[PDB]
From a paper:
Through an in silico approach to identify new macrodomain-containing proteins in this organism, we identify a protein containing regions of similarity to aprataxin, APLF and PNKP that we call APL (aprataxin/APLF-and-PNKP-like protein). Interestingly, the N- and C-termini of the APL macrodomain align with the C- and N-termini of human macrodomains, respectively, indicating it has undergone a circular permutation during evolution. In order to assess whether these permuted macrodomains retain important structural characteristics, we solved the X-ray crystal structures of the isolated permutated macrodomains found in Dictyostelium APL and O. sativa Q10MW4. Structural analysis of this novel macrodomain indicates it has retained the core features of this domain family, including the α-β-α sandwich fold consisting of a six-stranded β-sheet flanked by α-helices.
Residue numbers in the entry: 1 to 221
């Protein structure tokens, strides 16, 4: 759970099969209940940090999936403000109806991130994803790779490719996903595991570290 920060790596020439195209949620904002003003600033700033560092790397495509309820003109303006009116062409926000909507899966990204918990198991919010992967198969592969389970602020990539049991998933074969990344963002919701208290001094630092971890995974990926 120790904070490690960004470990980003510039790549000018890349393998098209290893393109850094990531679909990811607006971490901790819906079910987890993270303060949206705070999540917006952290998200926008982390995104801009990564994209600026990687100026001129055109393989990178970032698609942030935002639930309809949270999506607003004010939200988009807030992002614009953090980007100093220079919104990077490589970053898009995609409105989805809810965390289980089918529209989220065919966005053309080789890496697909989902929120998870320490258990690294299916949640009610990513049920649809897990049905598509086959729950038992994916959970078994997850447990084999990460036998000591997950820590808040970290991500856990699982390849659908090198993974024999998952290669035939619609997610891989039809929707072009190579890697599913389980993202352990900060939960603020008393009804979900490992809830942080409202003014925890660790909440903001750990959400940022979640983004760093995610983008570190992308740069390896």
């Amino acid at each position: 759970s120790k904070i490690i920060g960004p470990k980003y790596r510039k790549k000018r020439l890349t393998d098209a099969l290893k393109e850094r195209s990531l679909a990811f949620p607006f971490i901790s904002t819906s079910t987890f209940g993270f303060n949206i003003d705070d999540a917006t600033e952290i998200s926008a700033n982390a995104i801009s940090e990564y994209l600026h560092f990687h100026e001129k790397e055109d393989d990178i495509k970032l698609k942030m999936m935002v639930e309809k309820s949270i999506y607003s003109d004010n939200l988009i303006q807030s992002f614009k403000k953090h980007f100093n009116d220079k919104w990077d062409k490589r970053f898009e926000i995609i409105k989805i109806e809810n965390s289980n909507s089918l529209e989220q899966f065919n966005l053309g990204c080789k890496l697909f991130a989902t929120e998870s918990t320490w258990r690294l198991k299916k949640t009610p919010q990513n049920k649809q994803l897990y049905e598509m992967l086959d729950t038992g198969t994916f959970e078994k592969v997850t447990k084999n790779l990460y036998p000591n389970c997950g820590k808040i602020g970290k991500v856990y990539p699982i390849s659908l490719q090198n993974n024999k049991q998952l290669v035939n998933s619609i997610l891989h074969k039809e929707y072009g996903i190579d890697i599913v990344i389980l993202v352990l963002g900060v939960n603020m919701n008393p009804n979900k595991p490992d809830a942080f208290k409202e003014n925890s001094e660790l909440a903001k630092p750990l959400l940022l570290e979640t983004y760093h971890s995610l983008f570190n995974a992308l740069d390896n990926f």
